[PDB]
Chains A and B, each alone.
Chain A
Amino acid sequence: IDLQGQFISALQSLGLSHDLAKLLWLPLPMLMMLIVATVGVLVAVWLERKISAAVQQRIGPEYIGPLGILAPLADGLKLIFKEDVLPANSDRWLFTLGPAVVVIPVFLSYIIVPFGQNLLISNLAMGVFLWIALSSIAPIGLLMAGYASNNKYSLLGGLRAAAQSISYEIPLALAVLAVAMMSNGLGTVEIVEQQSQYGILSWNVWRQPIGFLVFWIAALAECERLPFDLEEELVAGYQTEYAGMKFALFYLGAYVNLVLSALLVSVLYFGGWSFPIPLETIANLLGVSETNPFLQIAFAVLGITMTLIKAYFFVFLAILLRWTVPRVRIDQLLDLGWKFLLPVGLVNLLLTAGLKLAFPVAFGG
Chain B
Amino acid sequence: PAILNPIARPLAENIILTSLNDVYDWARLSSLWPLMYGTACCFIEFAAMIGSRFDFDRFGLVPRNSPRQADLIITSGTITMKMAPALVRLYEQMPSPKYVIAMGACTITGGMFSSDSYSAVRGVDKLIPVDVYLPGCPPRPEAIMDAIVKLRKKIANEHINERGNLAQTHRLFTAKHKMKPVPPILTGQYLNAPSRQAPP
Contacts and interface: CB of A to CB of B under 8 A. Distances in A.
Q: Give yes or no for direct A-B contact (beta carbon below 8 Å).
A: yes
Interface of A: 53, 56-64, 68, 70-71, 74-75, 77-79, 81-83, 85, 235-236, 239-244, 247
B66 A239 contact: yes
Contacts of A235: 65-66
B30 A243 contact: no
Contacts of A58: 52, 55, 57-58
Nearest to A241: B68
Interface string B21-62: 001101110110000000000000000000010010111100
Contacts, number: 69
B95 A244 contact: yes
A244 B27 CA distance: 13
Given A59-B58, A235-B65, A236-B66, A77 B27 contact: yes
B69 A244 contact: yes
Contacts of A68: 58
A75 B69 contact: no
A238 to B, nearest CB: 12
Interface in B94-119: 95-97
B66 A240 contact: yes
Interface string B64-86: 01111101000000000000000
Contact of A83 (B30, B57, B58, B97): B97
Contacts of A78: 27-28, 30-31
A56 B51 CA distance: 9
Contacts of A85: 68, 95
A365 to B, nearest CB: 54
**What does DSSP make chain B's interface, helix, strand, loop or mixed?**
loop
Interface of B: 23-24, 26-28, 30-31, 52, 55, 57-60, 65-69, 71, 95-97
Given A53-B57, A61-B57, A74 B31 contact: yes
Contacts of B95: 82-83, 85, 243-244
Nearest to B27: A78
A62 B52 contact: no
Given A58-B55, A82-B95, A64 B60 contact: yes
Given A62-B59, A85-B95, 13 more contacts: A59-B55, A59-B58, A61-B57, A71-B31, A74-B27, A75-B31, A79-B31, A81-B24, A82-B71, A83-B95, A83-B96, A236-B66, A247-B69
Nearest to A53: B57
A243 B71 CA distance: 11
A71 B23 contact: no
A61 B58 contact: yes
6 contacts: A60-B57, A64-B30, A85-B68, A235-B66, A243-B68, A244-B95
Contacts of B68: 85, 240-243
B139 to A, nearest CB: 22
A276 B73 CA distance: 55
A56 B52 contact: yes
Contacts of B66: 235-236, 239-240
A29 B79 CA distance: 58
Contacts of B69: 242-244, 247
Contacts of A239: 66
Nearest to A243: B95
Contacts of B24: 81
B29 to A, nearest CB: 8
A63 B58 contact: yes
Contacts of A247: 69
B102 to A, nearest CB: 23
Contacts of A81: 24, 27-28
Contact of B23 (A56, A57, A77, A244): A77
Contacts of B55: 58-59
A61 B32 CA distance: 12
Nearest to A82: B95
A74 B30 contact: yes
B52 A57 contact: yes
The 5 closest A-B pairs by CB, nearest first: A74-B30, A78-B27, A58-B52, A78-B31, A83-B96
